[PDB]
Design a protein around this ligand. Structure first.
Ligand SMILES: *[C@](O)(C(=O)NCc1ccccc1)[C@H](C[C@@H]1CCNC1=O)NC(=O)[C@H](CC1CC1)n1cccc(NC(=O)OC(C)(C)C)c1=O
Ligand SMILES: [Cl-]
Length: 305
């Protein structure tokens, strides 16, 4: 019993963090086999941000311009390389601590654990969701860039995020491990803004199921609805459209609780149109959309890694 925001254990990923310096610019990298992955903007000083010609900057970078450090150990940098927004530094030394891992690309709505790091040293672990506007509500200070986001499949680390920038509103953007941004952003200092955000409907539903499971069910009622009847009511409260794909995945939680997705939906319609009426749900005074279905099975069934 209980239900918390909950991150994967970070130890598998702690052992992969290094500190990359390049002139004045120190940030964090991810050491796997004989290869460190970091943001290409490590080559840049605070000047170069306005319109960086990354190529012609990197063309003037000797491998002895790149310092790498795993704790108290320096590596010999031997080969560089640029792929999209991620720079690949090649080192004499494979990483003893390298776990099994697939570079993957999450879609908006999917959650992951962020290991905030500074100077290649881990500070903290927390959960976020890739927002539908392709941003994240992180906590990052200067030097955080290179910090990565990740999920775990028993023993395999699926890295899905490298951190690159803060947007006007105090929200954050970055890339997959191939160095492609989530959403429309670019890695220079221009006018860029998040764009309008929506509530991750399927995740809010999973939350409610999690709530039912932990004996919180005042919010329940004696009716149902249809998808499209609901998808009307949702858009008028700036919720995402609930796709048959989203019902499929909510399957397990529907099964276990003995509640049809579409009955829960009706309980949502109520809450949007009426509020919580001075009440909490799993001790929250508004609707939580940063727990996926899997994160709810994970935590209430108690999977391990
Ligand atoms: C990241 O590059 C980083 O940590 N770099 C190392 C560093 C060392 C010493 C001093 C500064 C930075 C930062 C991380 C940012 C800063 C604070 N919180 C973060 O998430 N990213 C940037 O600085 C980023 C790099 C650009 C994409 C390639 N950047 C540069 C310039 C401006 C902004 N953002 C911005 O102007 O928004 C507000 C909040 C309005 C300042 C930016 O994110
Ligand atoms: Cl709250």
């Amino acid at each position: 019993s209980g239900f918390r925001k909950m991150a994967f254990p970070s130890g598998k990923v702690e052992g992969c963090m290094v500190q990359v310096t390049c002139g004045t610019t120190t940030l964090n990298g991810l050491w796997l086999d004989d290869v460190v992955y970091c943001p290409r903007h490590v080559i840049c000083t605070s000047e170069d941000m306005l319109n960086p010609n990354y190529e012609d900057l990197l063309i003037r970078k000797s491998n002895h311009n790149f310092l790498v450090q795993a704790g108290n150990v320096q590596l010999r940098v031997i080969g560089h390389s640029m792929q999209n927004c991620v720079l690949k530094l090649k080192v004499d030394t494979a990483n003893p601590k390298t776990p099994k891992y697939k570079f993957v690309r999450i879609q908006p709505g999917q959650t992951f654990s962020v290991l905030a790091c500074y100077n290649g040293s881990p500070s903290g672990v927390y959960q976020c969701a890739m927002r539908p506007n392709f941003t994240i509500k992180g906590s990052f200070l200067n030097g955080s860039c290179g910090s990565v986001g990740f999920n775990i499949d028993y023993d395999c680390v699926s890295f899905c995020y490298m951190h690159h920038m803060e947007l006007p509103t105090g929200v954050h953007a970055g890339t997959d491990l191939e160095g492609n941004f989530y959403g429309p952003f670019v890695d220079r200092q221009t006018a860029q803004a998040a764009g309008t955000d929506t509530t991750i409907t399927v995740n809010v539903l999973a939350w409610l199921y999690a709530a039912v499971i932990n004996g919180d069910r005042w919010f329940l009622n004696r009716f149902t609805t249809t998808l499209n009847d609901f998808n009307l009511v949702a858009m008028k409260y700036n919720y995402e459209p609930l796709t048959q794909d989203h019902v499929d995945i909510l399957g397990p939680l529907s099964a276990q609780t003995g509640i049809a997705v579409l009955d829960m939906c009706a309980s949502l319609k109520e809450l949007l149109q009426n509020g919580m009426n001075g009440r909490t749900i799993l001790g929250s005074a508004l609707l939580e959309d940063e727990f996926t279905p899997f994160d709810v099975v994970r935590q209430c069934s108690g999977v391990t890694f």
